[PDB]
Coordinates of C-alpha atoms in Angstrom, one line a residue:
Chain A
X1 CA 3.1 -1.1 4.1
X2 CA 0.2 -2.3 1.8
X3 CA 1.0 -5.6 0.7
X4 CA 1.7 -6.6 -2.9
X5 CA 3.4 -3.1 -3.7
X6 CA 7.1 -3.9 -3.7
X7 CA 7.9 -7.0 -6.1
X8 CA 11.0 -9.4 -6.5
X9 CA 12.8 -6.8 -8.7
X10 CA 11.5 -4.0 -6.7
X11 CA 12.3 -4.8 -2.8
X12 CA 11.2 -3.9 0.0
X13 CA 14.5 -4.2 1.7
X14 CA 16.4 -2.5 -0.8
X15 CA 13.9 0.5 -1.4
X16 CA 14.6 0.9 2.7
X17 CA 18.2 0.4 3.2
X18 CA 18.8 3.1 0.6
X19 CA 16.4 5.2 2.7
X20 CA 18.9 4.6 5.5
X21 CA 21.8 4.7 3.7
X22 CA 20.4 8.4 2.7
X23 CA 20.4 9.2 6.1
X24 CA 23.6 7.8 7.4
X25 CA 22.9 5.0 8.6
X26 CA 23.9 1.6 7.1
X27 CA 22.0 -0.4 4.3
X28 CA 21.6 -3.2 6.1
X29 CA 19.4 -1.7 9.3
X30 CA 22.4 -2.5 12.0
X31 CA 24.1 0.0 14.7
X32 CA 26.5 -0.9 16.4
X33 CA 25.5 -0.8 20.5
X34 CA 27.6 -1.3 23.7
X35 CA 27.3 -2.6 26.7
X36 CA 25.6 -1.1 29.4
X37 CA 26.8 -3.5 31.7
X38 CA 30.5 -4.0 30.8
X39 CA 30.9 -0.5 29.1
X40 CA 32.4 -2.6 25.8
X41 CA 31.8 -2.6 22.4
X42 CA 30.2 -5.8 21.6
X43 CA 31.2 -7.6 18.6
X44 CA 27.8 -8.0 16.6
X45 CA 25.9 -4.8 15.2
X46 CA 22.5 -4.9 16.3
X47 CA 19.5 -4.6 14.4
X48 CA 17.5 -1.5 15.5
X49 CA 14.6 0.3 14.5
X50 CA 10.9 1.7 14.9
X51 CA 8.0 -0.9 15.6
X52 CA 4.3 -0.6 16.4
X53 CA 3.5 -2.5 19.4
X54 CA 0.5 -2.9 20.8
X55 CA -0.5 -3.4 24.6
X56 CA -2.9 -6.7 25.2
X57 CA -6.3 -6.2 27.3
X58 CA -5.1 -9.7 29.1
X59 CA -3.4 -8.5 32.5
X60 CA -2.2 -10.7 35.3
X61 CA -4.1 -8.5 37.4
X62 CA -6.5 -10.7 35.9
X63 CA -6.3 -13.7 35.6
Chain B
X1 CA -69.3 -22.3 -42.3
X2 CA -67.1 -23.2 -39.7
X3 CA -63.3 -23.1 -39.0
X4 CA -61.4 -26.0 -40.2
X5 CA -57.8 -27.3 -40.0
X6 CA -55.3 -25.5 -42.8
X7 CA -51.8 -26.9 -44.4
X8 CA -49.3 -27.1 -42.3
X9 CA -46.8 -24.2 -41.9
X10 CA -43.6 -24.8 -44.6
X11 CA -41.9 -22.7 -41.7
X12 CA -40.8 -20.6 -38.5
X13 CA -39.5 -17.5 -38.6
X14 CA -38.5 -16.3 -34.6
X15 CA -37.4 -12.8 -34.2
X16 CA -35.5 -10.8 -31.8
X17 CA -33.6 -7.5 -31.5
X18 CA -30.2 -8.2 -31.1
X19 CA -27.0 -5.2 -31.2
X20 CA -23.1 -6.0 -32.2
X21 CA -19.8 -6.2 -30.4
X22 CA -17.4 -3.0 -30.1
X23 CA -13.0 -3.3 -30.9
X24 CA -11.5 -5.0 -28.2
X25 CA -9.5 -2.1 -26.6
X26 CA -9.4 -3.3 -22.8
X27 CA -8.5 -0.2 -21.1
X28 CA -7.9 -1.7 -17.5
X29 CA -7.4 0.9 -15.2
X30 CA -7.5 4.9 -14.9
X31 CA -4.1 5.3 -13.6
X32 CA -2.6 1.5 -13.9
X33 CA -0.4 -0.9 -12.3
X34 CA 0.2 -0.8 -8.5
X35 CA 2.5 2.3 -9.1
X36 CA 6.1 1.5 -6.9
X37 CA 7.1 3.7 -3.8
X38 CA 10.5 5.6 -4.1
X39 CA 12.7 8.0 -2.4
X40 CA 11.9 11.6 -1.7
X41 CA 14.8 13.6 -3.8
X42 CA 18.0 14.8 -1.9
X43 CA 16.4 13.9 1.5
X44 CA 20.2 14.3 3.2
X45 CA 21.1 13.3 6.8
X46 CA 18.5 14.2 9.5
X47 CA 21.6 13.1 12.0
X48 CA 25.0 14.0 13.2
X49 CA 27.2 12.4 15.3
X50 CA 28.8 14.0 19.0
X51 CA 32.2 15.3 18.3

């Protein structure tokens, strides 16, 4: 992820979605979830993937 | 017998030691660019569906 390697003509999104779309998944980054709740398929495809996240050293415990 | 006052120079000569420019080739980098990332070959699905 080092920025200024991936240009207007060169994308980031595109060099990714056809990583995806390699792996049979869709271009775009969206699977289609259902409900948990109603057991349905809902209408929109969600966008999921892998993030980083961090945990904060502020706690209510704390403060 | 003593040292008097001469004619006045008629000039200055000032040296110095001075070396000369090269071509202008301006070889910018060893391996140049920022080179673009790109897709492993083949890769194929790591994934299959149930069923």
């Amino acid at each position: 992820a080092t920025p200024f390697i991936f240009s207007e003509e060169n994308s980031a999104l595109e060099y990714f979605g056809e990583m995806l779309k390699a792996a049979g998944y869709n271009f775009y980054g969206t699977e289609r979830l259902y409900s948990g709740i109603s057991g349905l398929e809902l209408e929109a495809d969600i966008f999921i993937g892998v993030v980083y996240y961090q945990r904060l050293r502020h706690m209510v415990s704390d403060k | 017998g003593g040292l008097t006052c001469a004619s006045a120079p008629q000039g200055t000569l000032r040296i110095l030691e001075g070396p000369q420019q090269s071509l202008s080739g301006s070889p910018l980098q060893p391996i140049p660019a920022s080179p673009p990332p790109q897709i492993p070959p083949g890769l194929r699905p790591r994934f299959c569906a149930f069923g």
